[PDB]
Design a protein around this ligand. Structure first.
Ligand SMILES: CCOc1ccccc1N1CCNCC1
Ligand SMILES: CCOc1ccccc1N1CCNCC1
Lengths: 179, 245
């Protein structure tokens, strides 16, 4: 089992902390959803290869441009997150996050992940976004952004229902193992 | 950590730590507030434990078993004794507030109603000046520590054997040298998230809402000062590279 490091980046409302919590427990918390995530080392076997995947969150570092890059050294795979209930979080992907990750993590694969996919057809979400002349991110808009930014791939998931969560981290592990 | 504190913070939440008969006596909003305060103290206990692994297991183990050149152990673990003193003191105040709040006859049933004042004290005056000075120094030495660690692990046989030996136990899985350094760097930016969520459930007493509002502002001021005071040190970087920053 070789050790690899994963870092998740994205806006404060993208759901990155929840995603790490749900993956690390294989469960959406039933009693208390933690506010923060410290770190975790997941044992993952993907395509016959055993990896210890260290997981890190950048939540709380968004406003601190000198502290935030301290999370990046020796990263093997980046999860770059946006929320499907927030077109504003998707707009910040090519503007701020992509040039930052390309500078501090040169040649590290980036997987663009659309979080909260369960809200795409949520009536309350659709009514709320319509007031700002917006709508939930469509899958083709996510794929196009991933293509434009040079992402390794595009994936979607729901931390609430767990759908797609295992697949995201197994693919991140495969990306981390590539030359 | 010591067994008494580990057991007091073993449960995933305050609502699972207290007796179910005690939990039933409180309003829903009080349970929400207490669950987030319990997460702040639980994560602070783990952060002090990370610093104890750095000072006692790694730093002191390297001094007592290895023949490293002078200034090498300090380079790997910059400011660790100062960081341990700051957070062991803060943890002591949090645990004493919990202990005073316990019901007579219980070692687990309590409610903390006055956290704001403790956070104002921690994040103002001389203790905030010491946190700012220590994190500005530590975070500016972060790249240098990681680079020194990698060089020693790749070239010194006795150093590699020592690291593999002390990090082999399952309880050290998340706590290798580089992992400890980043856990410490990331600790200060967890505070606003935790304080804001405690504040969200502390409107019941206006003086408490005001005190947590003041504490959140003080923590953000400290983070802004630390962030503006960082410049990565680099071994071998020439003066010309520095004054041309
Ligand atoms: C089912 C495969 O499980 C793994 C996957 C990746 C790394 C380690 C492990 N195991 C084997 C060694 N000890 C820890 C757990
Ligand atoms: C914090 C992200 O900042 C960047 C984003 C994109 C390219 C370069 C930078 N750096 C280059 C040197 N250090 C400061 C900014």
């Amino acid at each position: 089992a070789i050790r690899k490091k994963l870092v998740i980046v994205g806006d404060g409302a993208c759901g990155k902390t929840c995603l790490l919590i749900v993956f690390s427990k294989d469960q959406f918390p039933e009693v208390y959803v933690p506010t923060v995530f410290e770190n975790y080392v997941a044992d993952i076997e993907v395509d016959g290869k055993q990896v210890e995947l260290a997981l890190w969150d950048t939540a709380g570092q968004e406003d601190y441009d000198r502290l935030r890059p301290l999370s990046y050294p020796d990263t093997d795979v980046i999860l770059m997150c946006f929320s499907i209930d927030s077109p504003d979080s998707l707009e910040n992907i090519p503007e701020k996050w992509t040039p930052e990750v390309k500078h501090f993590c040169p040649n590290v694969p980036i997987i663009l992940v659309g979080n909260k996919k369960d809200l795409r057809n949520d009536e309350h979400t659709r009514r709320e976004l319509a007031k700002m002349k917006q709508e939930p991110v469509k899958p083709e808009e996510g794929r196009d952004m991933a293509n434009r930014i040079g992402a390794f791939g595009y994936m979607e998931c729901s931390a609430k229902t767990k759908d797609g969560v295992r697949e995201v981290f197994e693919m991140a592990t495969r990306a981390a193992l590539q030359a | 950590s010591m067994e008494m504190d580990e057991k007091d913070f073993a449960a995933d939440s305050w609502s699972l730590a207290v007796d179910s008969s005690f939990l039933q006596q409180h309003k829903k909003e009080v349970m929400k507030q207490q669950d987030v305060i319990y997460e702040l103290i639980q994560t602070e206990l783990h952060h002090v434990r990370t610093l104890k692994i750095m000072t006692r297991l790694f730093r002191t183990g390297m001094l007592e078993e290895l023949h490293l050149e002078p200034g090498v152990v300090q380079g790997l673990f910059p400011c660790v004794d100062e960081l341990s003193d700051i957070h062991t003191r803060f943890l002591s105040q949090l645990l004493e507030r919990r202990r005073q709040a316990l019901c007579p006859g219980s070692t687990r049933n309590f409610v903390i109603h006055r956290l704001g004042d403790l956070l104002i004290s921690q994040f103002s005056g001389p203790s905030a000046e010491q946190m700012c000075k220590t994190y500005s120094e530590f975070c500016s030495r972060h790249s240098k520590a990681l680079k020194l660690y990698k060089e020693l692990y790749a070239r010194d046989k006795r150093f590699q054997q020592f690291i593999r030996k002390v990090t082999r136990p399952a309880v050290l899985k998340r706590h290798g040298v580089q992992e400890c350094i980043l856990l410490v760097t990331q600790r200060i930016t967890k505070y606003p998230l935790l304080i804001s969520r405690i504040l969200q459930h502390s409107h019941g007493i206006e003086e408490e809402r005001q005190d947590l509002t003041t504490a959140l502002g003080l923590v953000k001021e400290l983070l802004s000062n630390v962030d503006e005071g960082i410049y990565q040190l680099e071994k071998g970087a020439r003066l010309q590279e520095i004054y041309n920053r």
